[PDB]
Amino acid sequence: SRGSSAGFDRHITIFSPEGRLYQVEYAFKAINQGGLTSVAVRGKDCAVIVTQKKVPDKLLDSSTVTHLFKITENIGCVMTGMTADSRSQVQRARYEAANWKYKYGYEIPVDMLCKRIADISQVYTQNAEMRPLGCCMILIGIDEEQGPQVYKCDPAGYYCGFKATAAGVKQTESTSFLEKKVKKKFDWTFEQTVETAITCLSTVLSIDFKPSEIEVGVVTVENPKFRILTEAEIDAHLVALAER
Amino acid sequence: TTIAGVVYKDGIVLGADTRATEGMVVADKNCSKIHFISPNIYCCGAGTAADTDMTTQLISSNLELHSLSTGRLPRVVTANRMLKQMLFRYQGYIGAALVLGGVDVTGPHLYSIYPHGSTDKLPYVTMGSGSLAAMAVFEDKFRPDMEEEEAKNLVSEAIAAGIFNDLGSGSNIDLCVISKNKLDFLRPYTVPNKKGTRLGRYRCEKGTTAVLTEKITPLE
Amino acid sequence: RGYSFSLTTFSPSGKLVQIEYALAAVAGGAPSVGIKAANGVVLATEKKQKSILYDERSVHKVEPITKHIGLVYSGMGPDYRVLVHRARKLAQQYYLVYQEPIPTAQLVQRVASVMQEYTQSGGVRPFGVSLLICGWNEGRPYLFQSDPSGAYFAWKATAMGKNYVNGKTFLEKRYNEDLELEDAIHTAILTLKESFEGQMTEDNIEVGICNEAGFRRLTPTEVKDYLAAI
Amino acid sequence: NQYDNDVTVWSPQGRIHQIEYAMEAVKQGSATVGLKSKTHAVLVALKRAQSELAAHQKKILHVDNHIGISIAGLTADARLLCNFMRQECLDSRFVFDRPLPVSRLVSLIGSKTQIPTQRYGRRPYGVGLLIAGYDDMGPHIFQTCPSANYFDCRAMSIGARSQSARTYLERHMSEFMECNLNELVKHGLRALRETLPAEQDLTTKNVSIGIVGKDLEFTIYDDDDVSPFLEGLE
Amino acid sequence: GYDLSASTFSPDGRVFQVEYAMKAVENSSTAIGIRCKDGVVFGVEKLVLSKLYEEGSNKRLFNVDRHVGMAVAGLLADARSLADIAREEASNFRSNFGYNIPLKHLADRVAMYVHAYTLYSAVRPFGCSFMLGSYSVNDGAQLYMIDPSGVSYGYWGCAIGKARQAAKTEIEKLQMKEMTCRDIVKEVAKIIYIVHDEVKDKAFELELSWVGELTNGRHEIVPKDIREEAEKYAKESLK
Amino acid sequence: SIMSYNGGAVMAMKGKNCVAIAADRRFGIQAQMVTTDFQKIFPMGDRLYIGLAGLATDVQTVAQRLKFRLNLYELKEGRQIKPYTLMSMVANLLYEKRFGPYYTEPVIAGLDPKTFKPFICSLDLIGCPMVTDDFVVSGTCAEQMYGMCESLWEPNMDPDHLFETISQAMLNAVDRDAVSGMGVIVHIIEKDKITTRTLKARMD
Amino acid sequence: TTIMAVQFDGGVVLGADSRTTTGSYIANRVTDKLTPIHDRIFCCRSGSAADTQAVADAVTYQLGFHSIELNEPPLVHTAASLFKEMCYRYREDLMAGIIIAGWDPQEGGQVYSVPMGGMMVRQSFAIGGSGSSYIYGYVDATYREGMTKEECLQFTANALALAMERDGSSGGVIRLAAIAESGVERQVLLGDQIPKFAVATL
Amino acid sequence: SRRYDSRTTIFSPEGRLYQVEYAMEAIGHAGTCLGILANDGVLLAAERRNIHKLLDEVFFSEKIYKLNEDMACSVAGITSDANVLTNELRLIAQRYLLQYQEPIPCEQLVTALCDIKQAYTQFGGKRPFGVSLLYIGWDKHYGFQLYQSDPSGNYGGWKATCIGNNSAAAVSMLKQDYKEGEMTLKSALALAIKVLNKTMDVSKLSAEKVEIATLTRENGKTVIRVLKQKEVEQLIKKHEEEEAKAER
Ligand SMILES: *[B]([O])([O])[C]([C][C]([C])[C])[N]C(=O)[C]([N]C(=O)C1=[C][C]=[C]C(C2=[C][C]=[C][C]=[C]2)=N1)[C]([C])[O]
Ligand SMILES: [Cl-]
Ligand SMILES: [Cl-]
Ligand SMILES: [Cl-]
Ligand SMILES: [Cl-]
Ligand SMILES: [Cl-]
Ligand SMILES: [Cl-]
Ligand SMILES: [Cl-]
Ligand SMILES: [Cl-]
Ligand SMILES: [Cl-]
Ligand SMILES: [Cl-]
Ligand SMILES: [Cl-]
Ligand SMILES: [Cl-]
Ligand SMILES: [Cl-]
Ligand SMILES: [Cl-]
Ligand SMILES: [Cl-]
Ligand SMILES: [Cl-]
Ligand SMILES: [Cl-]
Ligand SMILES: [Cl-]
Ligand SMILES: [Cl-]
Ligand SMILES: [K+]
Ligand SMILES: [K+]
Ligand SMILES: [K+]
Ligand SMILES: [Mg+2]
Ligand SMILES: [Mg+2]
Ligand SMILES: [Mg+2]
């Protein structure tokens, strides 16, 4: 124990002598290969997803570079980690949701969609022949009873709902930023949700963003359809922040 | 069979008779035709009895699995889709004709579901061999937004019409009243039919029946 | 395709090491406790709950299987969600046939059988969890544990996860057969207090109870109330 | 090394050793030559004989009236592929009542032979073919490899010491399009003869010839039937 | 060792077998695409490995639907199999939905197929990268590029194979948003001649194709006369 | 009609703390009697019996297949099956053949193995169950059986009176049916014993 | 049943009667036969209630998933194609006479018929169901190129009313819908609001 | 995938099957379990491993399983494996009963299971079941019987034997005390307690620590009973009194 290894326990998802799954641990490292960080925050009125948008190559059509994805009309997502893996996971989520609506006559709750994707990822941690997906999914939507929701699932098949959360390279630092900010708030609840998200991201990276360097997605109690902010809309937030 | 349902101001009233027949013989005088789907959703059944029993049990069971997972009260639409998609798949070979009613987060809902898988969402419906007698009562007397007791009166009148005018229907009237606040499964609601009494007694004393052979096996 | 060979095999000393390593994942999990009182069962568990950022209500460790049966675990959470799903399904298959709720012991046997499969069947590892399963039937409470081998045991009281050895001796010197459920809840929470670290709130432990009326989670407000004495 | 036993394992250089090893089976087969003019496609092959009393291995196979092949590598793989080709040809005559165009047959081969290069526990085909055909676009010579790549050729040689035959063909290829049939086959033989040890010669026992063109269905010439073509290498 | 299966992550979270497959594409000669005002043009440096081969042998430019061209680099048998997958997907889309598959959807679908070969010990990743190009009045010009991991993006200009970077730096000099396909073919030929290493690999064919307003949204080979002029322009520009 | 090919009749009846179940004894093929001691009532427990009428081959198959399932049930569980649970087990067995059913329509009679409360039920050939508090009948003379049971049955009968009623209901009912009879067997099930009788009966 | 749809410049109008029958019993007198398949695409259903409900739910699923994937509104032509595929493939097991109509940004208002058997044809206007027989001569005489939305509504309401009077399997209320870029506007004509044409007494 | 396959169903160079052997080591460490045939019955006696104070006691035994009307078994080795096998035994016994309408003869039941075990050593690439069994029964062909089967898929009949911890020692004591053709249930019970007294050398023997089942015939019916603790204590007492006599 303490970093012990027997047999093929670093190559496939069998247990190591401490009871760890090294291949699952290595899939969390794959999340950071991309070099990106995402943040998500929920208030009483809305939920927001913010992520870095890095377009190093001028020859890219930057309108095709996104990590924000519509899953249904009311459920949005930000993906962090290996891109092709992420896309595949987004497709599966779209399928699960559409399937749920066809069979059950009402939209999949965000918690259930996150649970299902997490249960599917679980299978990759117990069966030896395939690897986990090296990506992390954060889902936002409005629940009719519970209000705005933020849910995250990971390559271990763990999932949870959050007041706010993060993924990718600066996840820990974001978690500290967000933790410290909520303890301050009455009823431990965020209120300026887009500003908190962008500020968190901006601090942990030390950047001070241009509007083309981030992407912003929202769902609101008044407007539950998932919406992507334009550059101008993001700029209005950036400017309003800069001026106090 | 006569089964029926109404949407009233605060909920649903379902009704049913209690006769089951085999050919033109009464096999059960007190069959229970209003089946549990979930604590907030019930379903009257007509048609082939094993089919209505098994279909409602299966969907109730699958709904319980669903609500255990979701942690939420199930929806009437969800029962309706599951029932109708299964019945369609079987092409009308599962002879279940259903009246599905309940109360979910979006309020009261009532559907009739046919064996071949069509459904109709409506504020009053009837099914079974007595369904036209029951529907006459509804067309004549139904009003939107009835109070609970008026709704209960109307349903039980409609079931009575089927009981008295259809040879396939009889015996008792069962009701199930479902609101946001309450579930009243009223079995029997009314007993409008009773066997007459027995005028002559046939108490056959021991030895009346001749016996060829006898074995007593004692038990623990 | 799928690997068709077993990933658990016998070592030269006759041990199934993958199962022993699964048990080590269980031993490193967050603590769980179950106590069978005279008139019911309590299941209690610690949340490995960092952050105030967690919505503690969003996922539960203490879960209903049927109206009369509930579960908790120690070990890997996602493995546990598989077994919760199969247990629910098994309970419903039984109910469809027999039109009676599945007896607790019959549900444990069938779940334990699924865990056995994952110790032999092709291309898979064992489950890295142990389950504590509570239930009430035949007018009587039941507490079972089911481990990664598929072995199961009936307990009066036990502990699993981190610091379980001490938890069991804490319970050994504190459980009596004539004990009530309200007292049992108290001693269950004291057992978790033995190995806690953090200061307990109603948001970072979970408690479930089972009696004649059925199985249910205690609400945060109910747990808060029991935490006043502690 | 750890990279050479599975067709599914890329090496760190971006190569697949199993495919390269399969190509070696073709390089060690006996040489064959294929070339074409405006009107004919010809195959010429050296047949290896195990002992002095053995017949000499068939190298040239009939596929359809308009298509024949010469082989190098694993004979069992050559037959399996040949049987696939034959069936694809019969299918197209059955369906459409016209010959399968040669370039489409070759595409089908590329697609079929690629599949086992990408699945664990499968192996490449260990055979290379020269394909002679004639259709609406005229005569053709194609080459196929164990890598599943294929090539459209003015002329070609594969097998042991084929480099020599290839040089000869490059040297004289500007003459081929305008050649009459006899000239073209002579050229094929001269290319093939370059592959031989200096001592040894083309004989009726070791040479096999295949010809197809505008007025001629794919035909194989062996033994005494090659003598017309060998007399007047003068 | 950690690099023998696509179903094994390394301890740093990499999938070396996908990286190795990428190295096969980077060993290949260079292909480029450029999107412009009224379409998309493709050019490939097509190394001729023997003078015995016909002109046009081993094409690296394919029609995958009437409106969609494909340009490849890497292992050519894998690319061709991918061209078949793309064809089948465009064909199936037309059968099911009743209209020509939008480029982006086709790109995403074939990318998911590429992706599926990066998860398993049972199969190996594809050793090819490819570009897809189309044009329509409704969607305008579109150029996507997919790699062996299954990533798919859209581009103004793109290059794959061994002189990828040198090619990109030349492509960046163009104001392609304001140019026509007729202008861009010359520049494509120019760029292939710039990045071609004439010392190390001796002979090549330029392969050109385009799809735009001028072909009415059909992907077509650049006509012979126009290619020869573009070559002549490229060659004299090298001077 | 498939159900009349062999003929036959079973019934069951409830009394105070006891149940009774009865059957005719004929095995025949259309008009022809083959045997007169054919078994139709099978023990499923010390105090729990199932009676099957219908096509004789399916009477035997269902009893045998049911026993298979029950034995596995009892070995696996702690315990003797409850009457209601047997019913459900049989329902499930018959409904699996919903689209090619066994041609038999059973009755069950017994006492709860712990509480000793009386239970009777019947099921149709596809497994629809029917519990009653008085009696149940199945066979080619069901109408005759109904007429006798409706006229004679009374609540809360002691073992002796239950025996006389079920016996007179069976004998007189099957005497109006050509393809049932050739004897009657009656089991009375009490807490502390089973009493099995064959009745003096017409043999035509 | 009687179903109809009509194209106008910018959109479509759809209509149906509301009668479901089993033999000559009316099992629903206020059926909604116009079913939304996407935000601006409806189908009018005739034939088997079970079949057309199952097919419509299936196509709604397919179209919704396709639309999310493409991130654009679906084409009316796509919705019609998906009905056609399913109605043609299963033509031996279904009884479904469908009209698909709606609006999309590329082609505007469109009407397609998918009659039994599963052929698909675009039309200026379409009618179907058992009652359509009785209005061929009326629609052929009354149809004019270039009708406004309002004219399409009246034309539809009149045609349906005429069919309903004559066809025992049609009747009840007239449900109408207009679809355009701006959205979907639904209404019901009941009782006195249904257009009225005298019985020809002596 | 060839790299990860541990190849559980292949020979080693001496003609051995390593997994099978290895499974047999697992068994040797498990609870001691003995069977003894007598003229009027057969018995099983087993060391319990479920003995922690806080255990609840809910089934009628820990390691004794009823198979059908006329047969029972006990097990040593991996418990979950034993559950799969005993379930399969019950199924085979009911299949035979369904088909023939008579109980499966004991040896036939054993053989049927052993063929399943055998298969797991020859094909399928799976680990074998880590279980040895003792089977007791009565049938109409050979009366009272006792069998033993192991993970190789081998079985035999025995008059007395032992599997699990300290087996060799237990068999020596049986070799020396067992009277072929002359034992009764009452004397077999004495001998079983004698044997367990010696082979549980860690430490002092208690009724909480053993399980005894007897199989006898009464009024044409097989009776299978797990002895209650009152009786087990009484036999322990009689054995302890008997050893007091041992010298004078
Ligand atoms: B219209 O075409 O006349 C109308 C359109 C429909 C609502 C989409 N169709 C009908 O009214 C048809 N009726 C049914 O399909 C129907 C409804 C309820 C039950 C049954 C049924 C079917 C078989 C056996 C029993 C009952 N059918 C009608 C024209 O057939
Ligand atoms: Cl849907
Ligand atoms: Cl805030
Ligand atoms: Cl619905
Ligand atoms: Cl009815
Ligand atoms: Cl395998
Ligand atoms: Cl679940
Ligand atoms: Cl339950
Ligand atoms: Cl709960
Ligand atoms: Cl060769
Ligand atoms: Cl060979
Ligand atoms: Cl090659
Ligand atoms: Cl070669
Ligand atoms: Cl590249
Ligand atoms: Cl069976
Ligand atoms: Cl039609
Ligand atoms: Cl129509
Ligand atoms: Cl109507
Ligand atoms: Cl048995
Ligand atoms: Cl038996
Ligand atoms: K894995
Ligand atoms: K309808
Ligand atoms: K009408
Ligand atoms: Mg049909
Ligand atoms: Mg008679
Ligand atoms: Mg007679």
Side-chain angles (χ1 to χ4, degrees), chain F:
Chain F
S1 155
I2 290 153
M3 293 281 287
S4 73
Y5 185 78
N6 302 120
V10 306
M11 71 173 55
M13 203 162 57
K14 195 180 279 203
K16 172 63 158 165
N17 303 311
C18 63
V19 292
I21 184 170
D24 72 325
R25 299 206 60 62
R26 177 170 181 279
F27 164 57
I29 295 178
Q30 296 186 136
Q32 170 180 105
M33 179 273 287
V34 179
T35 250
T36 60
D37 60 343
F38 189 84
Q39 194 176 4
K40 305 185 189 190
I41 299 167
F42 303 83
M44 292 285 146
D46 292 347
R47 303 183 180 78
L48 183 58
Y49 281 65
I50 192 166
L52 295 103
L55 196 67
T57 185
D58 293 342
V59 164
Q60 284 175 336
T61 295
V62 175
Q64 293 170 342
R65 291 187 176 276
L66 175 63
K67 190 62 145 91
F68 177 105
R69 287 140 95 136
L70 177 56
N71 284 345
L72 291 178
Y73 178 98
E74 295 186 336
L75 285 167
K76 198 176 305 185
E77 299 251 334
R79 46 158 188 184
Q80 290 209 75
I81 203 167
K82 296 200 308 311
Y84 195 97
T85 310
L86 189 68
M87 181 182 83
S88 307
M89 176 185 279
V90 180
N92 177 68
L93 181 165
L94 293 171
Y95 199 79
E96 288 171 358
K97 307 296 180 182
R98 170 63 178 82
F99 301 114
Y102 289 113
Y103 293 102
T104 186
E105 294 199 306
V107 305
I108 291 166
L111 302 180
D112 187 277
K114 305 181 96 41
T115 338
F116 308 107
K117 189 196 213 283
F119 176 92
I120 61 169
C121 82
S122 66
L123 301 91
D124 75 8
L125 81 177
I126 54 172
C128 181
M130 180 180 93
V131 177
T132 75
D133 284 319
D134 45 34
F135 51 81
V136 294
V137 315
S138 175
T140 50
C141 57
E143 295 185 13
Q144 292 92 325
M145 289 192 284
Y146 281 130
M148 292 305 308
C149 292
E150 283 288 338
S151 304
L152 300 186
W153 184 84
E154 57 188 301
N156 277 29
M157 286 186 287
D158 74 2
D160 288 337
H161 294 245
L162 182 62
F163 169 70
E164 301 293 335
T165 304
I166 192 173
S167 295
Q168 286 295 319
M170 281 289 294
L171 292 157
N172 292 290
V174 303
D175 294 358
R176 288 278 175 176
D177 177 11
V179 297
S180 297
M182 308 293 291
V184 179
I185 188 172
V186 178
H187 304 278
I188 307 301
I189 300 158
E190 301 169 68
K191 193 180 175 247
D192 58 344
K193 52 166 160 177
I194 313 305
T195 308
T196 298
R197 297 169 177 119
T198 64
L199 305 185
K200 191 187 225 264
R202 293 194 70 86
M203 303 296 275
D204 57 345

Side-chain angles (χ1 to χ4, degrees), chain D residues 146-204 206-212:
Chain D
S147 62
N149 200 0
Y150 57 82
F151 304 84
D152 185 11
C153 306
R154 296 173 73 181
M156 184 53 56
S157 191
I158 53 171
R161 287 184 302 289
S162 52
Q163 190 179 96
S164 289
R166 288 195 293 281
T167 304
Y168 170 99
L169 296 162
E170 291 192 35
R171 178 181 324 127
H172 297 279
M173 65 180 179
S174 75
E175 304 164 35
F176 296 164
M177 228 48 86
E178 246 35 62
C179 281
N180 70 43
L181 178 57
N182 188 235
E183 288 175 310
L184 191 78
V185 170
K186 242 106 270 219
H187 276 307
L189 295 165
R190 288 198 209 94
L192 187 70
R193 191 178 53 186
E194 296 254 339
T195 72
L196 293 168
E199 67 233 78
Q200 186 185 336
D201 216 317
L202 299 177
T203 70
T204 57
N206 67 8
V207 167
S208 190
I209 302 172
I211 312 175
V212 59

Side-chain angles (χ1 to χ4, degrees), chain A residues 105, chain B residues 77 80-81 84 111 119, chain G residues 57:
Chain B
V77 293
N80 192 59
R81 288 263 166 151
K84 87 188 280 169
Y111 295 83
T119 69
Chain G
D57 286 350

Side-chain angles (χ1 to χ4, degrees), chain B residues 8 11 16 28 31 40 60 83-84 91 103 148 152 170-171 177 196:
Chain B
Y8 75 103
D28 202 348
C31 179
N40 65 314
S60 183
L83 281 165
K84 87 188 280 169
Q91 286 296 294
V103 178
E148 194 179 314
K152 284 167 81 189
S171 286
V177 179

Side-chain angles (χ1 to χ4, degrees), chain A residues 112 115 119, chain B residues 65 68-70, chain C residues 63-64 81-82 84-86 88-89:
Chain A
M112 294 303 297
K115 180 177 168 182
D119 292 343
Chain B
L65 255 11
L68 251 357
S69 192
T70 66
Chain C
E63 290 281 30
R81 294 199 315 272
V82 179
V84 169
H85 177 92
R86 292 285 284 97
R88 286 171 176 167
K89 171 66 170 177

Side-chain angles (χ1 to χ4, degrees), chain B residues 64, chain C residues 66-68 91-92 95 101-102:
Chain B
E64 197 190 334
Chain C
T66 58
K67 291 175 218 70
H68 74 303
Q92 287 309 313
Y95 187 82
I102 193 172

